[PDB]
Amino acid sequence: MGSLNQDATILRQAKLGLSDPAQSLSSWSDVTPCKWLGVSCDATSNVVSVDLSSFMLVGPFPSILCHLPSLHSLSLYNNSINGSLSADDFDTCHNLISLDLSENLLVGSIPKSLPFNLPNLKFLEISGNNLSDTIPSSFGEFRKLESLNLAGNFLSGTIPASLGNVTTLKELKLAYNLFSPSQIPSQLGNLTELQVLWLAGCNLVGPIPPSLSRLTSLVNLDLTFNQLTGSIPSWITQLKTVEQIELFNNSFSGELPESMGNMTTLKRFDASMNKLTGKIPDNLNLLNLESLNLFENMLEGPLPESITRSKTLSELKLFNNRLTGVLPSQLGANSPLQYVDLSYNRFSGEIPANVCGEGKLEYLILIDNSFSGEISNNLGKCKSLTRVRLSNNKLSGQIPHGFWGLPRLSLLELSDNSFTGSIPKTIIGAKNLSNLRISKNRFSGSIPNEIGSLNGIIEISGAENDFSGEIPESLVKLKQLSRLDLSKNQLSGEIPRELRGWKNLNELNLANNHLSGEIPKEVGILPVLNYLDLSSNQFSGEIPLELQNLKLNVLNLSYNHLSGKIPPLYANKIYAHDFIGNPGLCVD
């Protein structure tokens, strides 16, 4: 009765200083306090823990809760706790083990007296607020603290060296603050129990200090978005339990350490956006590897064959390097490969047949290589694929019949290869297709009528091929179509007179075909057309006067069989190059 009375009173007093518009604390306003929402008691009915996470509470920090004599845990995570923290706010909180104030609206400085008022803390989080001034040097005085998270605030100055005394620390998160340009303090090497060090976006400069080799329990090292320099130290290779190394977007140079391949515990490695030179290490036995990212470096050599030992590898992005040679034939066969971007390298040889072996492959990006040969029929059955960019390679042969109608395929970019054949009527199946980009190839046959059913399509770019027959009347009823480029082909016939469906059409480019008849009147009514190229055709008759409604970047009706008079808007001599090569055409 007594410790229930005391505690119910303390909790209700706390509640009256907060505002609760979602009515999260209705259960506080007949029943025992130990069964109220967010409230936990020990066996003698004393409140031990108060967890109000995600309760939409608004108001100052309810320091009255610290008057609860057995309170060890307080969470106000993800609320709208506002104002600043006073010294006095934690006067009575000396029993607390856990304090979580992350995701609120706190402003002002962290109190310097906090460690004196909170001597027993193990877990302190104030992540994602608007805190400012410096991290107090007095933080070195915590004798028990295991996890410190001040990530995502506006804290200034430099990371205090005194933090190195807090040798009970297993996690230190200071990422995403406004520190002055400075080095990683050497004293942080004292924190030999650290498993997580997250100093991303902390304006760090210089090398990773040598003293951090003493952090042999690191599981996660994350130093992304700094200007760190020097080698990636090879002692990361002899971390027995390392799972994640994140170094994206620094100025690291030299080579990846050669011994990397023996890091069996490693799940994720990212050293992208650096100045790394040399090769990818070989004799890789990276068994637990899920993700490797080395994009935007100056790496050279092959992708080693021993990457196929990584049977859980799902993400591989090495784009924007100087990588050479042929890729492992067995790549993907025994991996759940999901995202693969090897663009802008100097790879050669064929694309592995079983790259989508386990059916998980979504992105296959290989822009700007020298890949050769044909696309496997296995890829043509890879229904997981959403994004496919194979442009600017040495590829040839015919595309698999199933490859044009994969359900989730959004981008099919094949341009600037030697691909042959006709586009099959199985393209009807590609219900999510936005962008077809097949310029500069050697395709032939008709453009299928089935394309018109794909209501998503915004782009049909198939310039410089050998397409023939008429343009399907289907293509008019594609409300979302933006760009139609079928220039430099063998297309014959006319344009449909009815074009009101093309509300979003911006570019229409049909130059260098065998097209005929008059230019439809409704081209001038099209509300967002800026590009119109119908030159090098056999278009005859009078130029419609409705084209004067348009503001065009490009207007080219040259080298046709046109007749009559040029519309008066385009009468001036600067437009004259747009109409040359037409027998029966003059200016007034």
């Binding site: 992540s127 994602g128 990530a151 990212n293």
Partner: peptide
């Protein structure tokens, strides 16, 4: 509020 500690999803 805060980006997660993990890989970059920059791709072409």
């Amino acid at each position: 509020l805060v980006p997660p500690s993990g890989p970059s999803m920059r791709h072409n």
